[PDB]
């Protein structure tokens, strides 16, 4: 079964679904935060080493998984109608859906396995969760998983 919880960034902005995209908002908004599901992939040895544990990352209600797809010259973060359990239950590592989770204390960064120069990031209030190649400024790449 997967690990579940909410995700916030260092500005205390929680992931929430707004239409067809994930956005990051303060908990003051009183919107239901997405319940994120995370599960470690059974096949780490086949990928890059020393970059953190490769995980599948999805949401419950609606049951969707995050993946990385090249849209022209840009890797983009997308949601696909997919049950995280189906991916974990697949016999091979499904690379577009995988992210290296690199832990530093209470927070972790999420690096695309398909696009290693890009990381999952949030930015300003109510802005979408995207893939970024730009670190340490306007983009927030350190996230906390709150299992409750
Ligand atoms: C809550 O603490 C945990 C934990 C405790 C109890 C139950 C479940 C998890 C833990 C576990 C062992 C030592 C220290 C801490 C947590 O484990 C964990 N495991 C996986 C596979 C992924 C993620 C994860 C994904 C995405 C993001 C963004 C962040 N931040 C973390 N987290 C962790 O390391 O934070």
Residue numbers in the entry: 21 to 168
Please quote the paper that reports this structure:
All three agonists bind to and signal through a heterodimeric receptor composed of IL-36 receptor subunit (IL-36R), which binds selectively to all IL-36 family members and an IL-1RAcP co-receptor subunit, which is shared with several other IL-1R superfamily members including IL-1β. Binding of IL-36 agonists to IL-36R/IL-1RAcP heterodimer induces signaling through MyD88/IRAK complex leading to the activation of NF-κB and MAPKs signaling cascades shared among IL-1R superfamily members.
The co-crystal structure of human IL-36γ and A-552 was determined to 2.0 Å resolution. When comparing the apo and ligand bound structures, the C-terminal tail moves in order to open the pocket for ligand binding. Arg121 also provides a π-cation stacking interaction to the central ligand pyrimidine ring. Additionally, the methyl aniline inserts into the back of the ligand pocket in a hydrophobic space which is outlined by residues Val58, Leu130, Leu165 and Ile27. In this binding pose, less active enantiomer A-553 would not be able to make the necessary hydrogen bonds to these residues due to lack of proximity. This x-ray structure also rationalizes why A-552 does not show affinity for either mouse IL-36γ, human IL-36α or IL-36β. The terminal biphenyl group does not play any specific role in the ligand binding to IL-36γ; however, it projects into the space where IL-36R would be in the IL-36γ/IL-36R/IL-1RAcP ternary complex. The trajectory of the terminal biphenyl group can sterically occlude the IL-36R linker (connecting the D3 and D1/D2 domains) from binding to IL-36γ ligand.
